[PDB]
Amino acid sequence: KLPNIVILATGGTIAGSAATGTQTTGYKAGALGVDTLINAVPEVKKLANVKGEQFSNMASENMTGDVVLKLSQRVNELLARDDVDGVVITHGTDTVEESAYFLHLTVKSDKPVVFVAAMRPATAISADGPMNLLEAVRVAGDKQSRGRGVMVVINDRIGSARYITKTNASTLDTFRANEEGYLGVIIGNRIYYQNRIDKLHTTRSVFDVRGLTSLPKVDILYGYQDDPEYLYDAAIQHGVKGIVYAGMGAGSVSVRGIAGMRKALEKGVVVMRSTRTGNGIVPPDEELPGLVSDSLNPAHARILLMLALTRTSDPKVIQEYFHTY
Amino acid sequence: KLPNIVILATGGTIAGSAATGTQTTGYKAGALGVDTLINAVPEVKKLANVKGEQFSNMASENMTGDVVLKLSQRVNELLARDDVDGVVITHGTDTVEESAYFLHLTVKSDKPVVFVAAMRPATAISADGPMNLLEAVRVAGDKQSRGRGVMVVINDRIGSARYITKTNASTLDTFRANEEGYLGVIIGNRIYYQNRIDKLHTTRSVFDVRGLTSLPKVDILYGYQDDPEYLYDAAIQHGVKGIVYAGMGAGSVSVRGIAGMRKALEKGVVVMRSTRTGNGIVPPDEELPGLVSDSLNPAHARILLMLALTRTSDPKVIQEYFHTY
Amino acid sequence: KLPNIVILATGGTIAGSAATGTQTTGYKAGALGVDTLINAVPEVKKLANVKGEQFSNMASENMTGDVVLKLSQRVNELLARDDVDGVVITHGTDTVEESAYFLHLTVKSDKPVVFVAAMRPATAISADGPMNLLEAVRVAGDKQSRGRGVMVVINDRIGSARYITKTNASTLDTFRANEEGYLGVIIGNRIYYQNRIDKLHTTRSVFDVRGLTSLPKVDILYGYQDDPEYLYDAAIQHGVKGIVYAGMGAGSVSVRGIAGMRKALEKGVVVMRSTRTGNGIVPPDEELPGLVSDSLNPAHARILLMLALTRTSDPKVIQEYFHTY
Amino acid sequence: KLPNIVILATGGTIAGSAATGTQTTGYKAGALGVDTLINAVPEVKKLANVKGEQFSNMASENMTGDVVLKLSQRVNELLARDDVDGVVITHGTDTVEESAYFLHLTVKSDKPVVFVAAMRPATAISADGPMNLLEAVRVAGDKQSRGRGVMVVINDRIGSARYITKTNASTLDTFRANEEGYLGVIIGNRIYYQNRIDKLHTTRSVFDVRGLTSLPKVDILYGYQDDPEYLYDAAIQHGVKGIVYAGMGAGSVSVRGIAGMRKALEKGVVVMRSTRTGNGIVPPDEELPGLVSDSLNPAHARILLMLALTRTSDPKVIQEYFHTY
Q: Cβ distance D38 to D52 under 8 Å?
């Protein structure tokens, strides 16, 4: 009795095409339909009773929070059904970490939710998408995969949505969680589970988004030498509810950034200090403005802050979410 | 006879002094004088005849291009002297990669220039700065260190300014070049040189800023889901000469970012597409606006773009610099 | 109020003294007593009521299974007391992964057991041992630390005994688990727990060795081009019960190694195929002789095989241990 | 007008075949002929005028020094011809680091020598070998690739034979040089050169192995708790000329290992202390027996020690080879 798996397609390079097999840059993402992906790796049909559903077909640099919200709602609907055992979501690599972390916080099920992506288009020589998709279906259909939070499967690895990130612009092995590792790996058609994330997610999460149609506006500002105050002013003037700061080092702030953050706080904007570095802990520091992002990178911090702002604007409550989610 | 090494101090956590040995976060960077750093490691007198000079005493999140330019000019003056064999620059960790890469491009000497920094303040239990400084003096004084480009020495490693970056907010081992490795290591009081960088630098660089007192203004804008067009408008309106884009994946651009970039281009602003990921190549793509950053991360790309704009506004010339520096 | 923590000292570089602060590669491991370690970082007394006990004082390349057996027995006796909340074990770095994984399998308590070590001797400039010890006491005394399996704390990281390994001969940051990450990190005097290991250990382990005064003999043989049959013959002749093979790639075997493994199997030895590579899965392959090590590296595989052989010689039972511990 | 490249085939998983696309473990390495590999990627004919030559067809765990000698001799012959611009050598992954380093030391040419391999067989879903082979031909035919030492090309990366190693049993991204990085990368059909290795190789090497048909015998012994003296005795009795020790930590030796090494030294065996850890420097230590391996891992140390012994048994000369090659 095969597991029943929905393959929910959103686009991405995994569905991308170019004229020739040697073109691995500058191709069209989000060009092929979900059934074409399935039928390119028909071994998936040995692992599961699969059903393709075309949710969207875009390059992931164009994925937007209002669309991710709809995606989360659709996945929750699917997983409430007795005839669905898990869902695989085909997505672009550029922003999978954002979409996956959003669903990690908002899907109220222990059934597997497995994002899958590809760094080479479907037409490329040695395209990675076929094996990635096979692995993702294997993970989604395995009873041992339940209760693990949302996963991102690619290049034989299983990453937690909370930790995994695209670390390299262009390589197949780009998805890594340097300090936290992988939840598991898939080698020789077998899953090896290594870790369970020690954070709240899915069925233990407070972030209910049923019925919503919009999310709080959050922008991300970079930290660097000579960083300007005017970008703070511009964000404030355009109505942001939060600013995530991709800070120098451990969320450190220049005199110009401090002035911009104090203006934001005066206007009721929540300021969250993360890091541009790529990894590690931004620790509390009562001498600096704003909250701190724990080990969340800027992209992830923005997603959690948007969701936090659906429930509260209390900085103490938001800070505790950042230490527990 | 021993080498003659100038220790040119700019501040940083290496010169920071907290109230207790356990405080490693929330201390004051840039408090101790250069001679106090030297006198904490009097072993240095066995490696070199050292002289301290106090250039500045600031936390590196406050280092600015106008000041970095002065630092480069002062180092050029020092290295023009026959009685100086190399220079060690004590600096904060947060923006050492920016200052070091600027000097890498503008120092007109083959004599060693070694930036050194610390992740723990000088007061801390197991502070790293004492050993880092001893290692940096050993590197700067070794004849085999000549002609290597500017170096960053910390935690037993020798990094090229072009590749090294602070990858972790808070750990001792934060400086890494994941794809390019270290130029060398220092183990057991001995230097092991591994690589020479295959890029132009120092005495083979066209960038000369000895007749300047400031650099062209360049800002950095992040890429993420829902990234706003208005931050492009704000940069344009505040007189930027260049914009570096810390892009999704391989410099990929949303419909909003493309509209922003096209406005910038129409105003004569140079747009340079880098990556937020942390590593790897942004490849050319004629269907997208702007130039591409090769393997330069956003912080490094901004430094090179500022220097490029002192010489040309021809995008073909600038693009070639980004492939060769 | 404060937790009661026993510091059980075995030796190591953390207890080493050299003649100068620059000696980092020629000093003596296992020279200072436990109260000298404690009184050198007296800040531990603010985290715990600490009591030092001198178990041994040796360099860890000389640690032996018979002594590890006694260490495990003593830790079990300490943790059986109601007045002991946790134990920190000071140990050498070279074989901490072996001792720690043994206790991970044999300690019948959920109270924390934290191994700590140092890469520089106690006399070194920027010695790492003081901070590592302070961190280890913090981890051992935190209620959140219970039930995590045995831990190795060093360089601000908390590694599981099952995954952590010494990856570099000589650096402070040598302990890593590349594919599995860290259980947690210690930054700014705060613990950040990231993962729980998804394997059996401690109170859920079958490997009780209380009462033993000896262990099964298990040797490790390397795989390489031209590897010889005669080392298998020698091991058999000297009474091994098991051989761990540090194999080429995924436990792959030359014609000579296969001949040696077949002789061992003929002579009643259990053969376990691991990998020399450093990481990853050795998958089943029924066209090759012997068992497979899953993601256990050679040093860890030897420990598990030795303990397995106190309970069984059944290959199916042993193979399932390797997939679950 | 195109470069002339010989594809010299030796076997490996790149030439492997299985009965289904999902079998990625347990397959037959060295099953397919070189022209089958070429014909799978006729795109190569746009990069180069290629000619296949079948040297051998074996799994690389079975590659032996006598055969590597013949490989080096053949490559030297090919590169002496005006009508050969470079050579691509198809090889198994398990021991490519050994064969490649041997040729790095013995091929007296600046023309590119590029080893290529695959982690999945040619029949696998998302097999890596087609793109790896195209990339290797691109590298071998580019003028910019001359004088770089022997290279290993796989997974978009260009590794030096002296630094690259198989770090994972089973993943596509297994070849890494953690401390030294890659010489270059291949992205979007373009080569990005990053580093030149700062070591002696190829045209500057003293290791002349013309007329030789065999090499001095060198075995590798592991270091671990309870390591036995009798394996040294066995190696001595079997006539080894060298022993490479894959030591605990920084080549550290137990009381038993010391006794074994002193027996070996008394019989005129050269003892070379490397590390089992995976990375880094084994520093000199006059209180321990034998020589030290610098940053060479055990597999590379054995290759260099064998070749060293074709010139001398003087331990000070051999030590200097280990610091310079």
A: yes
- Say how many C-beta atoms besides its own lie within 10 A of residue A321's C-beta: 21
Q: Tell whether D191 is within 8 A of chain A (Cβ).
A: no
Q: Which residues of C touch D226 (CB under 8 A)?
A: 64-65, 217
User: For residue A214, what is the DSSP state?
Assistant: -
* Beta carbons of A194 and A185 less than 8 angstroms apart: yes
Rounded to the nearest angstrom, the gap between the alpha carbon of residue B243 and the centroid of all alpha carbons in its chain is: 19
Contact D118, D88 (CB under 8 A): no
| Nearest CB to A43; choose among D22, D26, D188 | D22
> Distance of CA D98 to CAs C226, D61, D295, D305, Å?
11, 11, 15, 12
State the Cα–Cα distance between residues A133 and A117, nearest whole angstrom.
8
Residue B113, classified by CB atoms within 10 Å of its CB into exposed (0-12), middle (13-18) or buried (19+), is: buried
Residue-wise DSSP of B249-276: TTTB--HHHHHHHHHHHHTT-EEEEEES
Q: At what angle do helices D230-237 and C230-237 cross, to 10 degrees?
A: 140
- Judge whether D183 and D151 are in contact, CB under 8 Å: yes
> What is the three-class DSSP state of B60?
helix
Residue A187 token pair = 């080698």
D219 neighbors C229 (Cβ within 8 angstroms):
no
Contact (CB, 8 A) for B25 and A273: no
How far is Cα C319 from Cα C272, in angstroms, rounded to an integer? Answer: 9
Residue with tokens 């991405």: A12
Separation between Cα atoms, residue A214 and residue B21, nearest integer Å:
48
Dist. CA B323–CA B200, nearest whole Å: 10
Interchain pair B185, D280: CB under 8 A: yes
The separation between the first and the last C-alpha atoms of chain A, rounded to the nearest angstrom, is 35
- Resolution (angstroms) stands at 1.0
Contacts of A92 (CB under 8 A, 6+ apart): A10, A11, A12, A13, A14, A29, A30, A58, A59, A60, A61, A63, A117
Q: How far is CA A158 from the centre of its chain?
A: 13
Residue among C276, C291, C303, C322 at smallest CA distance from C219? C303
Contact between C126 and B124 using a beta-carbon 8 Å cutoff: no
Residue D51 CA to residue B283 CA, distance in Å, equals 31
Domains of chain C (ranges; CATH) run 1-216 (3.40.50.1170), 217-325 (3.40.50.40)
Residues from chain B that touch A233, judged by Cβ atoms under 8 A, are 234
**Rounded to an integer, what distance in angstroms lies between the CA atom of residue C265 and that of residue C273?**
13
Closest residue on chain A to B26 (Cα): A285
Coil, strand or helix at C37:
helix
Angle at D74 (CA atoms; ends D69, D77), nearest 5 degrees: 130
3-state secondary structure chain C: CCCEEEEEEEECHHHCECCCCCCCCCCECCCCCHHHHHHHCCCHHHHCEEEEEEEEEECHHHCCHHHHHHHHHHHHHHHHCCCCCEEEEECCCCCHHHHHHHHHHHCCCCCCEEEECCCCCCCCCCCCHHHHHHHHHHHHHCHHHCCCCCEEEECCEEEECCCCEECECCCCCCEECCCCCCCEEEECCEEEECEEECCCCHHHCCCCCCCCCCCCCEEEEECCCCCCCHHHHHHHHCCCCEEEEEEECCCECCHHHHHHHHHHHHCCCEEEEEECCCECCECCCCCCCCEECECCCHHHHHHHHHHHCCCCCCHHHHHHHHHHC
| Cβ–Cβ < 8 Å for D121, D23 | yes
A126 touches chain D (CB under 8 A): yes
> Measured between beta carbons, which residues in chain A are less than 8 angstroms from residue B257?
61
A13 given a catalytic annotation? yes
* Cα–Cα dist A237/A217, whole Å: 12
Residue type, C187: I
- Chain D touched by A43 (CB under 8 Å): yes
